[PDB]
Amino acid sequence: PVEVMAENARTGSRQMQALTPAQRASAVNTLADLLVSREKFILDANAKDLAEAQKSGLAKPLLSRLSLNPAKLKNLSVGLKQIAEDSHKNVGRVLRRTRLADQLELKQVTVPIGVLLVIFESRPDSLPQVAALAMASANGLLLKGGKEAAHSNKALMELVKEALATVGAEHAVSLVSTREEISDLLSMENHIDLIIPRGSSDLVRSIQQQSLHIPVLGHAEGVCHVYIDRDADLEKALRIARDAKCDYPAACNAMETLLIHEDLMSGAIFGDVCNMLKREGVKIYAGPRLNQQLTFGPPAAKSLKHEYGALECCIEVVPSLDEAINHIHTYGSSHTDVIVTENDAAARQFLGSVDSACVFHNASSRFADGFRFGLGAEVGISTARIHARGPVGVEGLLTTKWILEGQDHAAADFAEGGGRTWLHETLPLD
């Protein structure tokens, strides 16, 4: 069934709630061990299921992401080991230690979010990742993929279920797929808490539109942007654009535009970068100001708010750093940004100005992946205006809960009628 799953999930969440000390670390340890001890099973499952899917040939991005080999298995094992190691005290943590009057102290402890419902096109290299995520943040977890690789996902589900049942006393994790009517449970409320799409632009778009009245994660479209300044040496910009566009054209956080100080048009930079893009075979559009400054020009642009995911990168140019700010905040989804120059003043004003999901200074918008931030294995990428930004580390799955241990106190007793006063002494947090 469906709802009984969610309730089993909540129950088990509270079950494993009181089991932090070396428990869940040991749990994901044994999970890694099981991952490295039942490989032939899961390897052959993935192989046969993907092979059976090949006869259909539904789409090359999927039919590529579906891959899985012992290398990826070693990678997942080591990543989950890292999560185990650094996941010591992400629950049951204090954040403030404050007193009000005699024997009147409070704090602000951490606590799970509840019953998450992750949705992704079958990239079965993800399932154990998020499973360890849940079992480290102790918040029980549902899962829901697509018909593709369903058998392999089922095998991984057996994996994680056994691994949890080792110690944990409850299967506080479940899979529900095979025609489960995304709109049906998506419409349901008061059981699921955080919808974490991961698959690709299709899922996140279809959700953000479809979804209504539910806390979600995941951005809309990774419309990056870049800037270069009159005080930037060129070869920087060159290799930067290389890392930016040349590397992984289908990446969510992959750059999709560019912007340059108009004055340095007279620096041959344009020719260098565009000849380089052609050396790497990159389709080129541009914008109105570029249509102005030159005669022949690359083709027109459909809409500045587009996305390509392949070797295509629009290009505009403006005179004002502030005009740059206007443009970034007007068109792009403000998922990312970057500045390249040597002056700090313009740089620091910029960094202090834009409200993207991050900024950089002589870096590569390919940097935003969490793993590159030493942030522990991320769970997604958020661009929403609340509760999480950019790389959503494991901390992006926790909330607060105030506790108070008084003796005999009350509200009216603190008024002038009683001998109760406020102190607000911020104790050293334990």
Ligand X SMILES: N[C@H](CCC(=O)OP(=O)(O)O)C(=O)O
**Which residue, 74 or 239, is less far from its own copies as judged by CB?**
239
Is residue 369 part of the contact set for ligand X (CB under 6 A)?
yes
Look at the block and give the residue holding tokens 């632009």.
201
Q: Give, as ranges, the residues between 206 and 265 that touch ligand X (CB under 6 A).
A: 251-253
Tell me whether residue 110 or residue 126 sits nearer to ligand X (CB atom): 126
| DSSP type of residue 244 | I
User: Does residue number 371 form part of the binding site for ligand X (CB under 6 A)?
Assistant: yes
225: left (phi > 0), else alpha (psi -120 to 50), else beta?
A: beta
Return the DSSP state at 22.
Answer: T
344, two tokens? 């700090």
Which partner, ligand X, its own copies, none, binds residue 213 by CB below 5 to 8 Å per kind? its own copies
Decide: is 3 part of the binding site for its own copies (CB under 8 A): no
Piece of 165-173, 257-265, 297-305, 364-372 that binds its own copies (CB under 8 A): 364-372
According to CB under 8 A, which one of 3, 14, 75, 250 is a site residue for its own copies? 14
| CA 201 – CA 134 distance, rounded (Å) | 24
Candidate ranges 50-58, 156-164, 259-267, 386-394; the one touching its own copies (CB under 8 A): 386-394
Strands 97-101 and 104-111, by their bridges, are antiparallel
Q: Should residue 71 be labelled a site residue for its own copies when binding is judged by CB under 8 A?
A: no
> 179: annotated binding-site residue?
yes
**Which burial class, exposed, middle or buried, applies to 257 when counting CB atoms under 10 A from its CB (0-12, 13-18, 19+)?**
buried
Is the separation of the CB atoms in 101 and 421 below 8 Å? yes
Distance CA 207, CA 195 (A): 9
Return the residue of 25, 358, 377, 381 that touches its own copies, per CB under 8 A: 358
CB 32 within 8 A of CB 131: no
- DSSP-derived letter for residue 359 is -
Name which of 269, 264, 321, 265 is nearest 293 in CA terms: 265
For residue 399, the cross-strand partners are 111
DSSP 173: B
Specify the residue, 214 or 251, whose C-beta has the smaller distance to ligand X. Answer: 251
The piece of 27-35, 59-67, 179-187, 384-392 that touches its own copies (CB under 8 A) is 384-392
Question: Which residues of the chain form contacts with ligand X (CB under 6 A)?
Answer: 251-253, 369, 371
Question: Which residues of the chain form contacts with its own copies (CB under 8 A)?
Answer: 14, 17-18, 98, 100, 106, 111-114, 193-194, 211-213, 215, 236, 239-240, 242-243, 247, 349, 351-353, 355-364, 366-368, 372-374, 384-387, 389-391, 399-414, 422-424
Residues making up the binding site for NADP(+): 179, 201, 220
